Symmetry: D2
């Protein structure tokens, strides 16, 4: 009898006209002759060996083994081979390292984000460890002494799987993740020896972490006698293991059982005298880790848009295979209209994301003006919250486009919704990032810089005037309308970027 043909993917570089148009606009000729063959290669991996490895990892979530059979506390995390293979891919394909090889100026970061864009949707969210890894590298690059950099950066930026390290960012505690002022981890002076010049020992509990699959982490802690709240916090570097391969006074409580990102180990950890090294000076921890957030927020946006592209690729292919009421779905005007609406949102998201990625590249190579640095600071929280909300909306619509099959896990479709929902939570909720945006307006004339940019780049008169109205509201009402303001700006910049890239 009848069996429905399921959705199939095709090379995700060649299938993505929007990505190609953007790169033709943002990459100079010399970058293109390196980057484009690499991207076509990665696009093939994304739908072949990576796709298989990601499915394996999703199907075999990590398992915590606290004790060996004779009672020794080992806190092992067992992972799938697929998960380990995707880590090796991240190293050898230079998914992080490409940004730090600045041959192509601002285009180095654009090239790297393009690699991430293809890699992430077939990575079972290994792209999240990559974001934290990239962030840690930059933080060390900016603030760490020469000896610490010489030790760690060759690992984080390695193209060699056998020497590649990932980093964790352990910022969230039970008191809060949005607000870290309640951080209860203490840092006592330490005078023992260590391989990285530890200065303190850490004591506390970290409530969401990427567990023990990372070799290093950055974290916040409060030194003996330091002030209460955020001002008392310093940034610390630590390595998870010693020479032995033994955990450095770190205990794993358990893995979280999550809605999605199931292949990613997310653990609750206790630091029990973990040796650590302060990065920067006392009380500057929050500000120091602040200057990395443009990276992690932009990784999140690019991953969210890659996720959107994956969901739509599956939906588009199915729409040309499933018939109802005598027609293929793609030929039903209402279905086609729905598809078109989602694709239009996709084009906004990818243009907005790469516009901002290019600004990040400019800043990293020292080409950004003072005002441009402020503009980047304003746009990244907006980009993040905008692409994340769109990714959830689009994923939910795609689940429904598959009908009953979309609700059944072995089709691979429910994962689209479960994983998308993370994008609007980690690294800031919609509302927290909307307030970060509003806050930014208050300082360094950020509001005016944003307005000059929108006027110069010919944002719509209607949206310009509506923005001016919203920004004249009371403090209280601007907070109440902070989402509206963020999405107004996001849509305006997305349209500007689309025109710029001829999308």
């Amino acid at each position: 009898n009848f069996y429905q043909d399921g959705p199939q993917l095709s090379n995700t570089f060649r299938s993505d006209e929007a990505l190609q148009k953007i790169l033709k606009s943002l990459l100079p000729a010399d970058a293109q002759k390196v980057a484009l063959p690499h991207l076509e290669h990665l696009g093939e991996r994304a739908v072949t060996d990576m796709l298989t490895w990601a499915q394996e990892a999703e199907s075999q979530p990590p398992v915590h083994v606290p004790f060996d059979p004779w009672g020794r506390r080992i806190d092992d995390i067992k992972t799938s081979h697929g998960w380990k293979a995707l880590e090796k891919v991240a190293a050898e394909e230079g998914i992080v390292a490409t940004a730090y090889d600045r041959r192509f100026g601002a285009a180095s970061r654009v090239y790297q984000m393009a690699l991430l864009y293809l890699y992430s949707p077939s990575s079972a969210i290994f792209s999240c460890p990559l974001a934290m890894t990239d962030g840690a590298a930059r933080a060390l690059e900016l603030y760490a002494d020469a000896d610490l950099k010489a030790r760690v950066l060759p690992h984080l930026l390695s193209r060699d799987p056998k020497t590649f390290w990932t980093a964790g960012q352990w910022m969230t505690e039970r008191t809060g993740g949005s607000d870290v002022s309640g951080t209860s981890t203490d840092a006592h002076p330490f005078t023992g020896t260590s391989e990285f010049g530890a200065t303190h020992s850490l004591h506390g509990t970290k409530w969401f972490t990427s567990a023990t699959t990372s070799q290093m982490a950055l974290t916040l802690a409060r030194p003996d006698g330091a002030a209460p709240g955020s001002r008392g916090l310093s940034l610390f570097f630590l390595e998870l293991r010693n020479d032995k391969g033994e955990l450095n006074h770190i205990q794993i409580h358990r893995l979280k059982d999550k809605l999605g990102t199931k292949a990613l180990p997310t653990a609750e950890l206790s630091l029990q005298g973990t040796p650590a090294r302060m990065i920067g000076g006392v009380g500057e921890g929050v500000k120091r880790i602040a200057s990395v957030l443009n990276i992690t927020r932009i990784y999140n946006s690019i991953c969210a848009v890659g996720h959107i592209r994956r969901a739509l690729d599956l939906a588009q292919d199915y729409s040309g295979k499933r018939q109802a009421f005598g027609k293929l779905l793609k030929d039903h005007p209402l279905h086609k209209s729905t598809l078109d609406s989602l694709e239009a949102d996709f084009r906004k998201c990818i243009a907005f994301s790469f516009f901002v990625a290019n600004l990040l590249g400019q800043e990293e190579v020292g080409e950004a003006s003072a005002s441009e640095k402020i503009l980047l600071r304003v746009l990244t929280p907006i980009l993040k919250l905008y692409t994340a909300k769109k990714s959830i909306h689009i994923s939910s619509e795609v689940v429904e486009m598959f009908g009953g099959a979309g609700y059944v896990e072995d089709t691979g479709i429910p994962r689209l919704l479960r994983d998308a929902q993370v994008f609007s939570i980690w690294e800031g909720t919609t509302n927290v990032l909307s307030l970060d945006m509003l806050r930014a307006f208050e300082k360094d004339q950020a509001g005016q810089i944003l307005e000059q940019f929108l006027v110069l780049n010919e944002a719509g008169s209607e949206e310009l005037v509506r923005l001016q109205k919203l920004l004249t509201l009371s403090g209280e009402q601007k907070e109440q309308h902070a989402r509206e303001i963020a999405f107004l700006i996001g849509n305006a910049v997305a349209r500007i970027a689309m025109k710029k890239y001829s999308l």
Copy 2:
């Protein structure tokens, strides 16, 4: 140190001012003196023994046991005690039966839907079998002879758990659920024995079913020699087991592993000569199930709005317990604005749902005018698609309101999203129901009756002309705008109902 206090529920009758206002409007005094004490009692169960049973059922999904240890095909489905307990609650509390005791005229159905509204969110979606059970009761009431009614209705409408039956509705096949014209199940004339006057034996595969724990089912099949497509389909009644308790030539292929509704068994079944009894004549099947669909689509809506209420109850309670940046969440203007927006959608949904529930009650007791019957027919698909989309949107926002905790399954919060996503899929997707709406407009000039209703009851000026603008469009452009039309109408009717009930 610090541990966050998690969300807590309270009696869901006493906590719901909107439900109480609606019932003060819709229930006459005599109905109130029976119904309100019953609802307060049920509201207490919803947050005590039912809540525990539902958690147990979610935690222990059903398991298929195809073979006994000696190779006999038994196709057992093992379920939790909690699941069985929630079934007993449905019977003893009259979650279905209350509607069929038409003591209170049209208010009997309103009283029943209020019971469902409190029951469903603490039922681990046992309310879905109840919808199909109610639908089957009505179909038999309208179309079955006295002997079949006397046999079956005392079971479906039982208040005695020991004699209560549920029904399945087996309409979807691999070829389609939206479009059932492709139904490939054959019905051969049958003269063997059965307890219910079987006329045919059925041969085919049913692709989504509530499996084999229901005692009876309604289904569609094509009798020998019948026309192709929908015109060849007849409605059939069948009982799943014989007196020995053996399945009547039904095999379970497997249970679906689903995104959500995990406590609910959803099975793929093969009918292998299952005896069945034709209800009505050849080619009348699709038309006969039309009045089963009105009931299930209103059940779906009431269940979706009860789900919204549960999500918001959890969010509201947490918002008074969780601190960030120096304030409880409920005291942050943006957080409060977000909550207010969700509550506003809730009030639209609950008013719209009970407005339609009242129309259903009017029709069932023979008190509905021609226009009211037409209004009921056009509004039911709109109500279903409207409440389903709102429930998904609100659930996703509530998951995000809990931050990282919202993404971790043991908090009970991710279930809100996973379960909500089913509401826009079963019983019709948004687009399929929007087209059903448009088709309904075209017949008996139903479209005109709706518009006079909207004009008479003083719908909003702008949205009305925008709505009127859309209904004058060409056929295909009208299809492209079918969603917008549905949501405009839904919002207009919700506003009318809220005013009517003083919400």
Copy 3:
């Protein structure tokens, strides 16, 4: 086609002629008119509601939940309803309490062991907590002050499920279970308050425990400044929880994943300042807990023989249902011979066990002579190691009697082997108990008392002379032959007991 009829059980009092003959010999008329109706009742439960509950418990092993969803350490152990129900049965049926109601003199213990014999094989090894409970009661009865006894004994000996307590015996540490001299748990003086007059706080790790399902435990610990090795150990009483239902500075590391006894929670625990009360004086812990071992060893023997009876009941029933080569298995001479051999071993085991149970009863009611107390001390380790080895041999033969089906878990047959294998491990291995036997010979002229008993009761001349030879060997050779000696004596006493009971 063909389906094999599987094995079925029948009332295990009425089906057991050997048990009935023994009780007709050991129970006086007044005891019989109470005990026999009770046993017939329990025999019916063993094959009805208990059997179902035990299967549920085996099918749903206990699960450790260390943390609540908000990070509080709760160390819950989730168990099946069946497991909880079997606990209630133990209380209401007086499976422990009957022995301590000494109306019937020495026959009270015999009556109780008969209850255990029927209960244990349908208890999913809840009989193990009962053994430790009985033991704890006796220890408190002998050595605890009046106030501690008045508090605890009404719980341990309760017939009321709502007030019934079980006890754990936490003797094994990582250094050893056979040899407890390496015990590393410290007992520091304690001056805080507690509900049971705690005198110390305990600090250490207990490597095999019955987890948190018990309300109290007995354990060994070394007080501040005490001698090394066994002589430095004292016996302690502790309660697992306080008023709150909170664990008293007890942390659960994990549950063991075991070969069998899967329904029984077996945990690794850390005592982290657990309040405890010393029982008896400093350094007498090993000797004090020594005087209970006759109880736990006899429980183990009775449970092992009940296990044998269950395996043989299943095998006998199957042998009358399965045909091969034209005959039922029971009519194949070699199969029948194999069955007869196993049954002969059963009759030895049950006679030996109840002979020893009767000696225990005599001692507990003060009717035992000095020599009889010594005889009991010699016979209990022999009984334990003998019945345990036989239970494993018989279970393995029964698995094989079922052919391929015996190797498949859903038949319930592999459990027979997996569970039996525990009998020869807990409470002493074959070799450790054989050496305990040899040790006993050395003191209080135990060897001669044993010989006088065997001669008086007309043991076989051949076995008598062989025993005399073995006992004249060197110290080294007697140890090498300790198993042979134990089984020679066990078989001799079993034959004596069988003749005495007309088996």
Copy 4:
């Protein structure tokens, strides 16, 4: 504090003096210079990469996937990478193929069985598919025409993992495995297409199989019109899949959930018109498989003895690491005596196994005398039942030697018992093989040849007359004593072999 050192293995060629002595006796110089380096290499793999792969396979049992996500029946079996790796090892190391390279005459089979002896205990029972693969190769060698041999033997005997095939032997049905006369699978004449010259289509159910990962199988079926019982059964060859990789009308009902051999897929299968090719004539099936059974029963024996060796290697190592009562276990006379007893049984088993392996080699290269061929036929069932019972006894004692740890699965010790218990069940129970032995005695006066062999080679005086006493008993009393006869003979031959090999 203290953590117990667990057991460790070492190269299992170098650690095995008995194996080396046997091979110095059985392998001529030219065979030794090839075989000994190969065996030392394999002995290293057994405790390194194979050990890890076997642990992985045990930890991740196979999973049946009956349907793809769109409802297609695929009956996939998902296996671990470790399982697949152990299959590749079997090919590349020539664990089967070495026997068929008869370079070394009868010593080729001895060399091969030595490879199997080292491979099997670290193979997670992949050695069972190898036994059936070897059996199938021999059957085709004897009975298949040139074209079928040319097609299939290069696969079964391949050293290239990419072309290696395994075979199933599907003999057992629900009616019986010991007695196959009840076989109900029909064979209808067939003229459709196939790659191997199929003659019939098979219809029936196979109750224990190694499932669908093997490429071919041998099986019994009753052609249309054939006689009832064994006289109607013919031997059939079939290939499981077509060129597309689709199963050839074979459905998997389920995988068995077993006591042990958990890595091995054991499935219940239905043949639904499976094309097959008759090998030989009608009614010759049972006779034709007789020479497949000799090979598999010797494989079983060698695997059982390799299992014994693994258990004892673990026990021996632990005995030098675990202290109790002031001494390492190995220095306690009773513990040492117990170990010595087990090792003595091991030496009997390994000598007996290779003695028979040599006879098999002699017969396969045409060098065996009439008496040797008869000796091989009578000894093979005895060897199988003898080694199987010893392996279970020794495994149980080894589990107990580890104390509580022996009962906990993560130590790897309980597997020893669970897996050993299969050896006395598959390929014939103790009693069925004992009767096979007796039947063999009765034909061609084989019984007499054995006894002269025993007398000639100077069997023990007492046991011989006791054995001679038993063989003169009446038919039925001889049946009742069939086990005793088998074990007397086994012990006598083991003593003869040990002397012959200087063990």
